[PDB]
Symmetry: C5
Subunit: 103 residues, 5 copies
């Protein structure tokens, strides 16, 4: 079991860490069929999604996907600094696997 | 997968984007049977709903409808600026498909 | 579909609109068996309930009853102005069907 | 149906009202097995629990127990004044049945 | 039934109390499959997890694990002082069993 987001990210293929150390610039969410997702951006233009739940996800991830969208929304609204994102780089927009917040 | 609300909106028939760049003026929600819905307005009078769930919705959208009502309520209470709404034109009030929020 | 709380209220028998234009004065909730309910009051003493779920509710209302209690608690805690309540007047305390919030 | 917490409390055996008119001093919660519970204290030392869900509860209470723990956490974090608690006094710590909050 | 986190923690093997009396320094959350977890740190470098749900957990603990991640997120965002953690010491990072907040 990892102790931080960088080591967690390294337990997966097709992932990378992005260091933001910034608040979220915009928060988008959709209830439209087959596009039940969230998208965040940063002022540097960087865009990330929480993927639509699908075949790629194991059952244990379903609650965690919902939690992540909850986390992004409240981080956005409270202007919380996002430290790092672990993302999958075989999706466009890059898909969030993990988030760290500090400072 | 789309990277922003405008492109997402364009993936659906008979939708449009409204640009508000304003906080929500009023928030209404109902538990009354067959009217389990939310209604928001802006100061210009513009009125939008989250639809009552029905057969027009696929299963994957049901959780997202609930999340959207959560989002609208907290956006209202925090006076968060709503950037755009993607809506369906064939409902009255216009039915929300997606929301974006930015400073 | 209605566009505001007043029109929604009028789609039901046994209802009335209360215009409060005030924050909630007190919030009460109970987990006691057969009394799993919330009660709110306003400054003038006027009292309203979210009813115990029961056979007078259809299945689609169960989630909306839980949402309404969520709404009333956060409205109370944030001192959000309640504009109107739509209530059923064939219950004591008057039973909330819908709420609108506006400053 | 009762109009207030005092009248509600009187509908049950083994209960009493505590009039606190104070914020919560401490909030404790546990996920440990068979001790999935919350405990609050007040500055006067008074201590209360939300009981572990069990055989003493009917199914309609399960969602209300979870809601109560949510309420106590947010009341704690926002320093909301608790007016009264209705508690079962045949338990140690005294077990919360209902809460009222007023400025 | 215990009356405080210290006595609760002593009902379990392989647990200990850490006294922090500090806000959470960082909050990390993951939706990655098999690492659906949260990690917190304190400025003294201490690191704790909420374990991935699994067979070491009885069914009643699953809702309480979700609640705990909710609690840690909002405690982080509000800079709430954590008084004590009860943690299992047979896990790395040490795994949270209970939390207390005061002052
Ligand atoms: C890389 C990949 O295809 N991942 C998909 C995963 O495949 C499993 C194994 O991949 C890892 C991984 O995702 O990196 C390997 C990591 O070590 C694992 N880490 C931990 C901490 O457990 C993760 C983790 O278990 C899963 O992610 C949890 O769901 O899995 C992959 O190496 C393995 O490959 C097999 C191959 O399939 C087989 O034919 C060949 O003979 O042997 C290879 C091993 O040498 O296959 C594993 C599945 O059996 O599978 C999951 C579903 O279980 C997803 O499909 C995952 O795809 C990504 O999913 C992401 C969201 O969760 C996101 O959408 C990404 O864009 C997807 O690529
Ligand atoms: C009035 C009443 O007893 N309502 C109960 C309802 O009864 C149904 C019809 O009532 C309405 C209503 O609630 O006003 C009629 C509205 O037009 C409907 N509006 C919409 C937008 O759909 C609603 C709505 O469909 C339901 O509320 C959704 O569950 O229903 C009622 O008129 C009808 O009885 C007529 C009868 O047909 C007629 O021959 C005779 O002359 O008079 C009767 C009384 O007007 O019966 C319908 C049911 O078959 O039924 C629901 C559940 O099925 C509830 O029991 C409802 O009671 C209210 O419930 C509220 C909570 O949802 C709240 O607790 C109130 O205090 C209850 O009275
Ligand atoms: C007193 C007691 O042991 N209560 C347990 C309950 O027993 C039922 C009757 O209790 C009441 C009550 O809890 O006060 C009586 C009230 O009038 C009811 N009020 C309303 C508004 O309905 C409540 C309510 O129905 C239940 O609480 C909902 O679940 O129930 C109890 O009096 C009765 O036993 C009588 C017996 O009938 C009589 O012949 C003899 O002379 O005296 C007995 C004791 O007074 O038994 C009823 C059930 O058959 O049952 C529930 C079931 O889930 C609980 O076990 C309840 O225990 C309390 O539970 C609380 C949490 O819900 C909390 O943990 C308290 O500490 C428990 O004591």
């Amino acid at each position: 079991t990892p102790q931080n987001i960088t080591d967690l990210c390294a337990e997966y293929h097709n992932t990378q860490i992005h260091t933001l150390n910034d608040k979220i610039f915009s928060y988008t969410e959709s209830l439209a069929g087959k596009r039940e997702m969230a998208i965040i951006t940063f002022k540097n233009g960087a865009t990330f999604q929480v993927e639509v739940p699908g075949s790629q996800h194991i059952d244990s991830q379903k609650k965690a996907i919902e939690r992540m969208k909850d986390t992004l929304r409240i981080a956005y609204l409270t202007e919380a600094k996002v430290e790092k994102l672990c993302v999958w780089n075989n999706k466009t927009p890059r898909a969030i696997a993990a988030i760290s917040m500090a400072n």
